[model samples]
Target: DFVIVRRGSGNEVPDDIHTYLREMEVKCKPKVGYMKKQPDITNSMRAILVDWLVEVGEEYKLQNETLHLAVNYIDRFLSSMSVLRGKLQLVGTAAMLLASKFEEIYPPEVAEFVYITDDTYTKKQVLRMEHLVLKVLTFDLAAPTVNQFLTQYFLHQQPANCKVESLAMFLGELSLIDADPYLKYLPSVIAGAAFHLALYTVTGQSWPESLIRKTGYTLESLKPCLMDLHQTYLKAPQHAQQSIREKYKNSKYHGVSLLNPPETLNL
Candidate 1:
């Protein structure tokens, strides 16, 4: 009941929202191997853009969901359309702008997003690109993200701890930086794997039946994603993009980024 009724309100029905999110997740799934179609943008370039978006999210104090939504927009757009290298940042900026408008109560002004680009893009350019993103994405903005699934999964934890919550978030964000393998897994799979890894990191626990029933994923089914996410955790320190790590290193997040990954996850 915690997972189902926690977010419910007087007028809102949680079960309906959950069912809608599950359906939307499938409908809004981005195509795998979309990078092959792009002649100009490389995976590394996309990684750089995602890393930069993390910094932008922090600078604007945007919600974590907003960051994930913006990246979803970027990936979905790139899946169908080929973009030039020079315009990649424009696309990312516009995605974040659109996501902010959708997710934030007082989204930053368009001018702020433009300024964040250091005048590389004018406000008009951002607005135009935003329109393009909307059209290309067909106005599908509510894609279920890892954070959303994690929110549901966390509610299912019997005795939740902040360390597990923070570490799971750190791992989830790390997965977003690399598109090659992580993109192939669904958001719910990633969420389950993050929780698995986080629980192990904090208390040496593994996937349990309670979570299996709630998330509909078994340890065997989650092994692939768990392995990939675990590797990402081990490599986070040496990663070129440190924004995500730096954000998690703060005391407020319990410095989960500073915690070392086990040499072997023993899956």
Candidate 2:
């Protein structure tokens, strides 16, 4: 998923957007979501829940930012509470409800969200949990997400064309499905790394001095995370990848999923 970027308070791209990105990075840190239980409620399970949320967001034509915000809410709640596996869908639905209110022009009705779940959770259950989630999060839903910074990076970097933008978007979405990267890097860095990988995919060129200086990361510094992202991209067709793949394939996004981003065998 991607976002539409505009300039600063003055509506102009800064002298170096990376500077802006660095300053804004503090707000986008996501909680390292973990649960004590085994496969019953693992990170993989959480990833699937987020994937389903994306499906719901797409179904209702929600903005990419709204979906991303909902995912953040889910992670924060999961990190704070040791919820039962049975209630995972309820948590996800409640997060969406909160996010829709924050980001949607006209948020979906509570009943509409329950319908998507096929009545897995009643509206009463959703409402109850929605309050609990707000209590847990303390109403701090203003956290920034990677897609937020990724949009700024792209607008400043201005990838060669839509092909590169699509590739970056594909890589960006891939990062969200995995559990590790979010815990380790700032949102700006993760977004920068994805943009780096996408650029490498399009042009087999070395990292430019301007980018290196601007993003404050050496290629060596970014390699481990970037490589991890590359590996996941290769296997995306198999694991929980279908929904995202199908989403980007739409005409609105320029069929980015159809193209290949660069890949590497290096660990």
On lDDT, the candidate that comes out on top is 1
Candidate 2 clashing pairs? none
Q: What are the models' TM-scores? A: 0.93, 0.84
Full-model lDDT, candidate 1? 0.86
List the candidate 1 regions with Cα displacement exceeding 4 Å.
Answer: 1-13, 16-18
Candidate 1 versus truth, CA RMSD in Å, comes to 3.7
Give lDDT tens digits, candidate 1, residues 94-141.
999888888787788799988888899887889999999999999877
lDDT of 1 at 247: 96
lDDT of 2 at 261: 50
Residue 70 miss distance in model 2 (angstroms): 1.2
